[PDB]
Amino acid sequence: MSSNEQERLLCYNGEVLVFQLSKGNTKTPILHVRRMVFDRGTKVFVQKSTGFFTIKEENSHLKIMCCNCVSDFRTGINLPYIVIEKNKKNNVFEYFLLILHSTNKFEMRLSFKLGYEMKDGLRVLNGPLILWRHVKAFFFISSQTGKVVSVSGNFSSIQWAGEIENLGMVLLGLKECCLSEEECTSDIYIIPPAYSSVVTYVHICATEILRISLIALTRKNQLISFQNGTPKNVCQLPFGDPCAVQLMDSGGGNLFFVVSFISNNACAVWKESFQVAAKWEKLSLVLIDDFIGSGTEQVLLLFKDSLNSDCLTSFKITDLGKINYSSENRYLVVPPLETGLKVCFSSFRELRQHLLLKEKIISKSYKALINLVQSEQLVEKIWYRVIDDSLVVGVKTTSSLKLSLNDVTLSLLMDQAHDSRFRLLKCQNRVIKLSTNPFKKECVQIITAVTSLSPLLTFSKFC
């Protein structure tokens, strides 16, 4: 949280960082930093080191703004930043950026000095790149340049931001749009613009060639998947006000999406079955890392500083798998518990391994069947159009095909899942022969058929 005496938190490479202003009497307040780690002996947290940063001016309204690990450009190394507002109360604000070392020592990289005040749609990227916007005026400043700059395209909001391979830095504020920052301005395999009305936050997964695999979520308390812009795999949320999402691996295929809310609650949902697996409430803050030293990542949940004027109390940690922690002999049975647990997990693993064989055999049988009935391209291509209420479908063909020796047809068939009832489909077939520049020589021989359309537009769609 942001104030002259409040603090903010962060996770980093198996440990946790607390950034707290301390009114240092003589002095204006001083930033004081704790670096702490989970115990696993007492299942508590411990100071492993600290640092600090003295402040010079006699101006209050020093303010933490945000924090994360950012991957400096001069190195390519993940590193923790902090952003400070320094309000001299002259209606003038510095807006410092600092980044801290392994040494527990700081290093400034942007002063940047705005007269007006940002709140913002503020965010931070790879080369220590600040990105912000006051009213419909999108700007960014790097540490390389060190100067205020604006963006070409005008947007509403700039939800996603991050580097992508073969492009450098990219943004997404309008799904139509697809910018750069270097040479401002691909808009090709982006979502349904129908879905453009609803989505408020995005988190991308991966990239191929153009193609991407991407995730979204709407104001409708949803959670969506996209691959090549294909709306597969939607879920639904308990709560409202979807703030944002992250991810966790938690070992082999035990993957999870982890959604915060502005309502101070959250959900964890499993993959291979888009589905809530767990839900938590009141959630002072959230973080994702291997705090243990197990190999894989875990999650931390913080409950409600209502409890104490102390942050690091009131905690819970859980993989959702074999890990769970929080704040008359009975010991003969522990070993059987662990044994049953681990055998269960083993069978889990092997079930996945077996399922795959099932599907493999299925595909084997598909191909075997298709061969069981039995090379050249007897077609070039399909095409089709609407007229007004009479769909038509047609086919351009080849010299391989001769209509003088074979009566031919063109049927249609429907995929019954959409339209789940008996009814017939009738199509009328037409040869069409044409000549191209007579004034051997090209003779075109297309084949096509027609039928009706309003009967089929039943589920708004079909295939």
Binding site: F422, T458, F459, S460
Partner: protein, 98 residues
């Protein structure tokens, strides 16, 4: 079909549980059998009907004379019967009794 001469397996009608229109509506947008009866005088029925077909006194010639129009009534004549289940034009199955 229950009284069908040929005993054909003409499949069930299975009338539409929705309109195309209402399917479209919802698909973008995201029990006691009722019964009734009447009665009437045996004497009224005889004196009106009689025309003696053969005469299985009542309920049977009653059913025939009720369904003299429906062409599957000369079949009930061969199978003189005071209750059957016909289907409908528009779906659901119905029984009647006399």
């Amino acid at each position: 079909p229950g009284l069908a001469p040929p005993h054909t397996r003409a499949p069930s009608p299975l009338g539409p549980t929705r309109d195309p229109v209402a399917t479209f509506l919802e698909t973008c947008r995201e029990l006691p059998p009722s019964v009734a009866s009447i009665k009437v005088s045996a004497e009224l029925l005889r004196a009106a009907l009689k025309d003696g077909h053969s005469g299985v006194p009542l309920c049977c010639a009653t059913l025939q004379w009720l369904l003299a129009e429906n062409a599957a009534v000369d079949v009930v004549r061969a199978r003189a019967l005071s209750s059957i289940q016909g289907v409908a034009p528009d779906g659901a199955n119905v029984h009647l009794i006399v």
